[PDB]
Amino acid sequence: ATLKDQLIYNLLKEEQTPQNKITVVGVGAVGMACAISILMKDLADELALVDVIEDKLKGEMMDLQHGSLFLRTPKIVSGKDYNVTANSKLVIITAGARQQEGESRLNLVQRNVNIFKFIIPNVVKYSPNCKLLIVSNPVDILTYVAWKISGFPKNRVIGSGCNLDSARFRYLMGERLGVHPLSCHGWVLGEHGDSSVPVWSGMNVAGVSLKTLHPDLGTDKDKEQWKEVHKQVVESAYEVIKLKGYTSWAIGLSVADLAESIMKNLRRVHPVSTMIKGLYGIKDDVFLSVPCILGQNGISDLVKVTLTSEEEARLKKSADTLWGIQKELQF
Amino acid sequence: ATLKDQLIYNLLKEEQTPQNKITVVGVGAVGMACAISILMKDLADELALVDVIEDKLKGEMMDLQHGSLFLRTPKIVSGKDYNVTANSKLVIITAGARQQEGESRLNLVQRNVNIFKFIIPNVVKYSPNCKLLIVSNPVDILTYVAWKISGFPKNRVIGSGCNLDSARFRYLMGERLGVHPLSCHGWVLGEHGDSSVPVWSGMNVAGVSLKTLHPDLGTDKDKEQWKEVHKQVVESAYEVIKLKGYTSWAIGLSVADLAESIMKNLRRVHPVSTMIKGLYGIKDDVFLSVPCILGQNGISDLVKVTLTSEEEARLKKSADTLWGIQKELQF
Amino acid sequence: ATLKDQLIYNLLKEEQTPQNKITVVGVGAVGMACAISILMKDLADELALVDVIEDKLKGEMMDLQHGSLFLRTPKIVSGKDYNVTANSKLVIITAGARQQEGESRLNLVQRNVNIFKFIIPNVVKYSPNCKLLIVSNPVDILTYVAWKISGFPKNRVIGSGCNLDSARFRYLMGERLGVHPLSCHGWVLGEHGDSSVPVWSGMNVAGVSLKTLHPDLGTDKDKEQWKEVHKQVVESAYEVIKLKGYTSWAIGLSVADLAESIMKNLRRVHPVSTMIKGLYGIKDDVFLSVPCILGQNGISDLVKVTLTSEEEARLKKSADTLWGIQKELQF
Amino acid sequence: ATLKDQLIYNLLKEEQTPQNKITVVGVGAVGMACAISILMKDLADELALVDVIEDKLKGEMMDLQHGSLFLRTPKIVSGKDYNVTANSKLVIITAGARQQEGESRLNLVQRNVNIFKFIIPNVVKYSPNCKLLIVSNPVDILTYVAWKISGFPKNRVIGSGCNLDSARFRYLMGERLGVHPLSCHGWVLGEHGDSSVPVWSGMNVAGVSLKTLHPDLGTDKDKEQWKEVHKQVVESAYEVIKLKGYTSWAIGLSVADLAESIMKNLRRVHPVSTMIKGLYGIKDDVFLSVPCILGQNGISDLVKVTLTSEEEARLKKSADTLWGIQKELQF
C-alpha cells in the first residue's frame, strides 16, 4: 500500500555486508580530510566515523551524507560505539587530545596513549583482520603503542610516518627544479618531523642522481644550500601550524594515497613507519619509516636502503630514543 | 652551472599562461571545501585563493601545496591582492562576515554587501570574462548584488542556489526508497534554504512519477508524510549547523559539480539561482533557482518547469520579498 | 645473494586472495572494450580473460599488461583453462561464434548456445558466488540460457539488455534538446534490438515530462516525429555495424557502468534484462529489460514501471516470442 | 510551438568555441585506443577524428557518441576534411599505410612520408598553435618529417618515442621484483623499438640504484641476466604483434599519459622523441627519446642524462643511421 512497494518489487532481502569498508577514528581536521579524500578517490564502499564528541561526530557524518549524490560510497555511518566499525578492511586512527597552552609534549604523549588504550581494543574487537593505519602524533611512538595493544602482527600495523615528509620534500624539490613533484624522486626516512633523515643518495630526476651530479649536495660546501630543502621540510610544517593552527589537507591526501595502495593491493612503495627490529642495525621494538611495499595484507615487504654512516647513526639514535621513552609509557 | 642547469637543458622561455584557472574568494570552511573538491576532481590547471586574513590564507595555500604530489593541479597561489586571480575562467565567492551575538540578519546582509562591494570590482578588473559563482549567504540576494556590481551579463553570474537543497532532497528521497540518490530524481527550486519549493510533479525513479503513482504526494492528507522530506531539506541544514557549527563538505562537493559542468562545457542541467525576470510570472530583477543548462558560457539556457498554482505563487511571493530587501540595500 | 633479496626484505609470505576480481569471457572487440573500460574505471583489483583463440588471448593480455604503469589493476591474467577465473565477483560473457556469409540469426543462435553450454559450467565451477553479466547476443535468450545452466538464483544472472539501447536513446534525445545525455532521462525496455519498447511517459528533463508538454509525443501524428528517436535507437546500431563492421565502444562503456554499480554496491537503477516471470503481466520464464536496482548481490529489486496498454501488449508479445524460441533450444 | 522551445528558454545563442580540444588522425586500432583512453581520462572538451576511410571513420565516431552518457567529453566529431580539427590544442598522428605482402620497409616509410605530406599541412592550416604528437612508425623518422613539413618550433613537435618502451621496461622490472611498475624506475632512451638504449644507472626502487647493489646489472657476465629485461622490451612488442596482429592498448594508454601532461601543463618528465641536435653529443637534425619536461607548450626542457661511453656511442650511432635514412627520403 506504501509508495515504495508500489514502485519497487524486492526479490532478495539480504542483509548488507560491507566489502571494502574503511573506518576513520577521530573527526578533527585531520580525520575529516582523510575522510573527504578517501571519498573522492572512491576507495571504499562503506565509511564509518568514530569520535567521543557526539554532536560534532553526527554533524560531520550528516554533512558528508548530504553530498552522497556526488560520491560513489553508498553508505556513510558514524557513532561513539564501535559496532559501526565492524569488518573494516582498514582502520585509520586520527584521534588525539587537544594540547593545552603551556602543556608539555611529555604530558601530551601519555594523554594520547591513554586515548589509544580505549580505542585499540575496541577496533580489534570489531575488525580483528583489519589493517591499522596510525596517523596521530607522535606517530612513530603511537604506532608502537597500537601494535602492542592490538597484538596484531607487524605487517598489519602501519604508521603514516614520513610519507607526508617525503611529499613535502618532493614539492620543494619540484619548486627548485621547475618539475612536477611526481617526477622528482627523493626519500625522507626515520622519524616523522624534526628528526627525519633525508637520503641524499636517492634524490633524482629521470634516474639522474643529484648527489652524483653535484657531489656537495647535503653538505656545508653546497653553494646552493640543498640541505636547506630538508630544513624547510621540517620548518614548513611548523609554518603551516603557526599560520592556520594545524595541518590537514596534505596529510589527508597522503593518507588516501596509502589507503589506495592497501585497498587495491597495488604493492606500491611508500615511506611509512614500520616495526624495524633486526634491520638497519636496530635491535629494539620500535617503528621508523623505511620504503615499504603496501597491499591487501599491509606491509608485505620493505626496501633495504643503503645509508651513509651519518644517516645510519641518526636512525640508530632515533631507535634508542624511541625505545627509552616507550619503556616509560604507562599502558 | 647550478645544479638545475647541470641537470636540465632549457629550450624554451615562454611566459606561463593558465588555461583552466579557478579562484576561490574566502578560505573559510566553505571556501576550502570547494578548493579541495575542485582539486580532487582535476577541474583546474591553477587554483588561486583570496582572503583578508593573511596568515590563515597563506597556511591554507601551503597546506594544499604540500599535497601537490597527489594532485593534478600544478600551480596553487594565494594573496590578498587580486593580481593572483588574473584571467580566471571561474571565480567562486565564499566570503562573508560572521553574525555577532544577537546581530540582526538584515544588518548582517548589509555587511556582506559591503564585503562584495570590495570583492566584486577587484575580481572584474583582473578576470573581466570569468563566470562568477556566488555561494555566500543570503545567496539569492548576494547573487543579485554581485550581478549589479559586476556589470556582467546574467549568463555569467550564477548563484549556488538550490543545487545543494536538491542534492539533500535526493539523499533523503534515496534513503526512503533504498536507491542511490543518483537514481532518485527531484527538484527543489526558488530560494535557497527556508523558502525553497519542492516540485512534487517531478519526483521520479526510472521516469515513474511518484505523484501520479501516489497522488497524496506533497499534501497534508498524506499518511506517508512525503512533505516531511522537504521539511528535512531545510531542517537538516540547521541541524548540521547546530551539530558542528557550520556546513562545508556538501556545499563544497556541490560547488565542484557546478564547476565541472561549467569548466568542461557539459551542458548538464542543475538547479542554480539565475536572474528570473520575465519567467514564472516574475517582473522584478531577482535571482531564484530554476533548472539551468551550464557550460563554458555559464547559464546558456534554462528549463521552464510547469508549476502548480501553489508553487507558482510561492515563487512570486519570494520575488516580491527579494525585491523589497534589495531596494533597501546600500551598494 | 640475488638482486631481489639484496634490495627487498620479505616480512609477509601470505597467499594472494583476489578481492574485487572480474572475468571477461570472450576477447573479441566487445570483450576488449569492456576490459579497457573496466581497467580505466579502477573497478577491479584483478582482471581475468578467457577465450578459445589462444594466440589472440595471450596477445591481448600482454598488450594490457604493457600498460600496467598507467593503471590501478595490479593483476591481469589469461587462460583457456577456467582456473584463472577462480573467485570472481563478476563474470562477463562476451563470447560468441562468428557469423558466416549467408547465415541467418536462426542458424547462429544455437551455435552460441553450444558456446554457453561450454562456458557456463566452467564459470560456475570456479566462481560459485559470482554475478553473471551476459552481453552475448541474442542477449535475452542467452541470459535465460546462462540462468538455466548455471542454476544461479535470478538475482545473480543479469542480461546487458536495453542498457545500451537506453544509452543511445539518451544520446539522441540530448542531441535534439541540446542537453547533456546525463540530464536527459528516458527508458527503453523489453528486448534488446528490434523489438525494444520506449516508455514515452518517462522522458523528461528536470522532471518535466515531455509527453505532458507535447501530447503527440510517441505517436504517428507527431509533427516533430519524436518516434523517430527510437527508430534511430535501433537503426543507429545497424548503421554502426554497416560502417565499422561491429559495435564495441558504447557497449564497453555501458558494461563498465553496470559493473560499477555491482562492484561498489551503489544500488543505482539501470535497464537490464532479468527473469520477469510473475511481473509486468508476464507468465513465462523469460528475460526482459526493466529498471533494476543493481548492487553487490546483483538485481536485488526492480522498478514497477506503469505501462500503457500498447507498451504492455508488446512486452507480452516479446515474452511469447522468447518462450517459443527457448522451447526450441538444445541444452 | 516546438517542444524544445516549450521546454527550454534560450538566453544566449553564442557560437561554441572549444577550449581543450584534441584531434586524433587515423582511426585504426592505435588511434581508437588513443581516443578511448583520452575519453576515459576526461582530457578533452572536444575530440575530433580524421581518417581517409570514410565509412570506418563515421562508424567509430558514432560508436563513441553512443557512449556519451558515460563520458565527460560533450562533443565528438569526425570527417575527412580537416575543418573539424580547427583549434585543437593537441593533434595526435597515428596514420600509416599497410606494408604490402613482401614490401620493403624503406619503400613503406616513403609511403608514410607521403601520407604526412598530406596530413601535416592540413593540420597546421586549421590548428596553427597545436602541439603535434607523432605516433606512427618509424616514429623517430616520422617525427622529424612532421617537424620539417610543419615548420613548427621544436617544442611543439613530439614523437611518442620510447615512452612505451619504458612503460614495458617498468612492467617487466616490476614482475621481477614483485613491485608495482609505478614504484619501479627505469629509462629506455634512443630509438623506439629495436635500437633502444636502457640506462642501467637510472634503474632504481625508492632511489636505491640497482646498478650499485648489483654491479653486473646490464653486463653479459650478469648472473641474473638483467640484459634480457631490455631484450624483452623489444621482443614483447614483436610477440604481441605476432599473437594478435598489432599492438594498441598499451600505446593508447602511454599516449593518453603524454596528453595528460601536455593538456594540464603538468611539467612531468617523460621519455619522448625530440630534436636532439646539439645535445647528448649529436650533430644531426634527428629526433631521439630523452627525458623531456612536458607541458602546455610541449617540450620546454629536457633532462641531461649522464650516459656511459657505450650508451653515448649507441645514441651517436642511432643519430647517424636516422640522418642517412632521412637523406634517402623525398619530401
Ligand SMILES: NC(=O)C1=CN([C@@H]2O[C@H](COP(=O)(O)OP(=O)(O)OC[C@H]3O[C@@H](n4cnc5c(N)ncnc54)[C@H](O)[C@@H]3O)[C@@H](O)[C@H]2O)C=CC1
Ligand atoms: N603523522 C603526520 O604526518 C600528521 C599527524 N597529525 C596528527 O593527527 C592528530 C589529529 O590532528 P587534528 O585533527 O588537528 O586534532 P583534533 O584535536 O582537532 O581532532 C582529533 C579528534 O580525536 C578525538 N578524540 C579524542 N579522544 C578520542 C577517543 N577515545 N576516541 C575517539 N576520538 C577521540 C577528538 O574528539 C578529536 O575530534 C594529531 O595527533 C596530529 O598531530 C596531523 C598532521 C600530520
Ligand SMILES: NC(=O)C1=CN([C@@H]2O[C@H](COP(=O)(O)OP(=O)(O)OC[C@H]3O[C@@H](n4cnc5c(N)ncnc54)[C@H](O)[C@@H]3O)[C@@H](O)[C@H]2O)C=CC1
Ligand atoms: N549557498 C549554499 O548553499 C551554502 C553557502 N554557505 C555560505 O558560505 C559563506 C562562507 O561560509 P563559512 O566558510 O562557513 O564562513 P567563514 O566566515 O568561516 O568564512 C568566510 C571567509 O570570508 C573572508 N572574508 C570576509 N571578508 C572578506 C573580504 N573583503 N575579502 C575576502 N575575504 C573575506 C573571511 O575572512 C572568511 O575567512 C557563508 O556566507 C555561508 O552562509 C554555507 C553552506 C551552504
Ligand SMILES: NC(=O)C1=CN([C@@H]2O[C@H](COP(=O)(O)OP(=O)(O)OC[C@H]3O[C@@H](n4cnc5c(N)ncnc54)[C@H](O)[C@@H]3O)[C@@H](O)[C@H]2O)C=CC1
Ligand atoms: N547486449 C548488447 O547490447 C550488445 C551485445 N554484443 C554481442 O557481444 C558478442 C561479442 O561481440 P564481438 O566481440 O564483436 O564478437 P567476436 O566474434 O569478435 O568475439 C567473440 C569472441 O568469443 C570467442 N569464443 C567463441 N566461443 C568461445 C567459447 N566457448 N569460450 C570462450 N570464447 C569463445 C571467440 O573466439 C571471440 O573471440 C556478440 O554476440 C555481440 O552481438 C555486441 C554489442 C551490443
Ligand SMILES: NC(=O)C1=CN([C@@H]2O[C@H](COP(=O)(O)OP(=O)(O)OC[C@H]3O[C@@H](n4cnc5c(N)ncnc54)[C@H](O)[C@@H]3O)[C@@H](O)[C@H]2O)C=CC1
Ligand atoms: N610509437 C609507438 O610506440 C607505437 C606506434 N604504432 C604505430 O601506429 C601506427 C598505426 O597503427 P594501427 O592503427 O595499428 O595501423 P592501421 O593501419 O590499422 O591504421 C592506420 C590508419 O591511418 C589511415 N590513413 C592512411 N593514410 C591516411 C591519410 N592521408 N590520412 C588520414 N589517415 C590515413 C588509415 O586509413 C588507417 O585507418 C603504425 O604506424 C604503428 O607502427 C603502434 C604501436 C606502438
Ligand SMILES: NS(=O)(=O)c1ccc(Cc2c(-c3ccc(F)c(C#CC4CCCC4)c3)nn(-c3nc(C(=O)O)cs3)c2CC2CC2)cc1F
Ligand atoms: N618519532 S616520534 O617520537 O613518534 C615523534 C616525536 C615528535 C614529533 C613532533 C610532532 C608532533 C607531536 C604532537 C603531539 C605530541 F604529543 C608529540 C610528542 C611527543 C613526544 C615524543 C618523544 C618526546 C615527546 C609530537 N606533531 N607533529 C605534527 N606534524 C604535522 C605535519 O603536518 O607534519 C602536523 S602536527 C610533529 C612533527 C613536527 C614537524 C611538525 C613527531 C613524532 F612522530
Ligand SMILES: NS(=O)(=O)c1ccc(Cc2c(-c3ccc(F)c(C#CC4CCCC4)c3)nn(-c3nc(C(=O)O)cs3)c2CC2CC2)cc1F
Ligand atoms: N533567498 S535569500 O533571501 O537570498 C535567503 C534568505 C535566507 C537564507 C537563510 C540562510 C542563511 C543566511 C545567513 C546569513 C544571513 F544574513 C542570512 C540572511 C538574511 C536576510 C535576507 C532574508 C532575511 C534577512 C541568511 N544561511 N543559510 C545557510 N545555508 C547553509 C547550507 O548548508 O545550506 C549553511 S548557512 C541559509 C539557509 C538555511 C537552511 C540553512 C538563505 C537565503 F538564500
Ligand SMILES: NS(=O)(=O)c1ccc(Cc2c(-c3ccc(F)c(C#CC4CCCC4)c3)nn(-c3nc(C(=O)O)cs3)c2CC2CC2)cc1F
Ligand atoms: N530478445 S532476443 O531474442 O534475446 C534478441 C533477438 C535478436 C537480436 C538481434 C541482434 C543480434 C543477434 C546476433 C546474433 C544472433 F544469433 C542473434 C539471434 C538470435 C535468435 C533469437 C531471435 C531468433 C534467433 C541476434 N545482435 N544484435 C546486436 N546488437 C548490437 C548493438 O550494438 O546493439 C550489436 S550486434 C542485435 C540487435 C540488432 C540491432 C542490431 C537481439 C536479441 F537480444
Ligand SMILES: NS(=O)(=O)c1ccc(Cc2c(-c3ccc(F)c(C#CC4CCCC4)c3)nn(-c3nc(C(=O)O)cs3)c2CC2CC2)cc1F
Ligand atoms: N628509430 S626509427 O628509424 O624511427 C625506427 C625504426 C624501426 C622501428 C621498428 C618498428 C616499426 C616499424 C613499422 C614500419 C616500418 F616501415 C618501420 C621502418 C623502417 C625503416 C627504418 C630503417 C629502414 C626501414 C618500422 N613499428 N614498430 C612498432 N612498434 C610497436 C610497439 O607496440 O612498440 C608496434 S609496431 C617498431 C618497433 C618494434 C618493436 C616492434 C621503429 C623506429 F622508430
